């Protein structure tokens, strides 16, 4: 939502959802590319983490 002076305010969940979707989408990208399994692993540790 906004406040009077143009400032916004939010709930902390949206950050988490953003991190999740960024990570999943990047993963899909890396899966289109047959890239090395090591970065797959890292992206998934990042996923389960988030």
């Amino acid at each position: 939502v906004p406040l009077d002076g143009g400032r916004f305010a939010t709930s902390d969940l949206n950050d988490l959802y953003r991190r999740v979707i960024n990570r999943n989408n990047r993963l899909k990208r890396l899966l289109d590319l047959a890239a090395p399994d090591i970065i797959v692993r890292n992206e998934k540790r990042m996923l389960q983490e988030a």
């Binding site: 960024n22 990047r26 990208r29 890292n42 990042m46």
Partner: peptide
């Protein structure tokens, strides 16, 4: 933002 995301994107530019 955060470390690992800079790293991952860096691997993309690398590839």
């Amino acid at each position: 933002l955060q470390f690992l995301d800079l790293i991952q994107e860096g691997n993309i530019g690398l590839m």
